[PDB]
Amino acid sequence: SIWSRIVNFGSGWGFWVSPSLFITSTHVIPQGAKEFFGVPIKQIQVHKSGEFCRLRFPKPIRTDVTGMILEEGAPEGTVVTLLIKRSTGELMPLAARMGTHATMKIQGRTVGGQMGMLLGTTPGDCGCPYIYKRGNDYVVIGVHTAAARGGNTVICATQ
Numbered sequence: 001s002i003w004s005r006i007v008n009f010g011s012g013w014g015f016w017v018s019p020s021l022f023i024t025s026t027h028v029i030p031q032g033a034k035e036f037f038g039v040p041i042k043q044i045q046v047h048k049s050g051e052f053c054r055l056r057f058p059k060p061i062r063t064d065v066t067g068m069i070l071e072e073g074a075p076e077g078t079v080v081t082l083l084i085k086r087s088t089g090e091l092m093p094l095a096a097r098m099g100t101h102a103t104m105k106i107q108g109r110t111v112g113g114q115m116g117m118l119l120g121t122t123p124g125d126c127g128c129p130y131i132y133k134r135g136n137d138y139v140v141i142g143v144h145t146a147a148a149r150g151g152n153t154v155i156c157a158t159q
């Protein structure tokens with residue numbers, strides 16, 4: 001039921017990490033949104049770090065899901081799964097080995113990202129999660145923001 005946590009958000013998608021934590025790409029969100037999922041935006045705790053957007057709701061929204069671990073990137077060489085969901089409803093899991101993780105700071109504020117190579121993606125896919133299993137837990141490392149033209153390179157934005 002992991003696929004049920006991937007919901008269309010604005011021009012792309014978003015992922016429920018826990019009953020109250022929703023992650024997406026910053027620039028797929030409508031610029032004039034005054035509410036999300038029935039909750040006024042004033043009551044939602046928003047944290048935008050570059051192209052990584054994080055929404056913490058004041059109550060459990062998805063009371064049916066379990067909590068996963070949100071971590072900034074994956075150790076280099078880790079292969080993860082980009083859970084792409086298309087407009088048709090078709091489910092397309094893509095494998096990608098993760099490479100160099102980069103971070104840029106300005107004024108106390110760190111934006112993050114990590115590159116990967118697919119082992120494709122299209123303009124409607126921003127916001128779909130990158131995930132891999134570690135032990136008896138599932139770890140989500142970011143949401144897709146970019147992909148090289150024609151090649152295998154992809155990029156997940158990190159917190």
Ligand SMILES: *[C@@H](CC(=O)OCC)[C@H](C[C@@H]1CCNC1=O)NC(=O)[C@@H](CC(=O)[C@@H](NC(=O)c1cc(C)on1)C(C)C)Cc1ccc(F)cc1
Nearest residue numbers: 011025026027028121122123124126145146147148149153
């Ligand atoms: C997703 C964002 C979106 O809504 O699309 C239309 C604006 C989109 C996904 C890639 C486009 C083609 N295939 C994809 O997987 N991302 C973008 O449009 C972002 C920019 C790019 O992806 C370019 N690629 C790169 O910059 C790049 C660099 C490297 C090393 O690899 N790729 C082009 C392929 C367009 C920009 C964007 C826009 C809006 C967002 F919300 C996030 C990101």
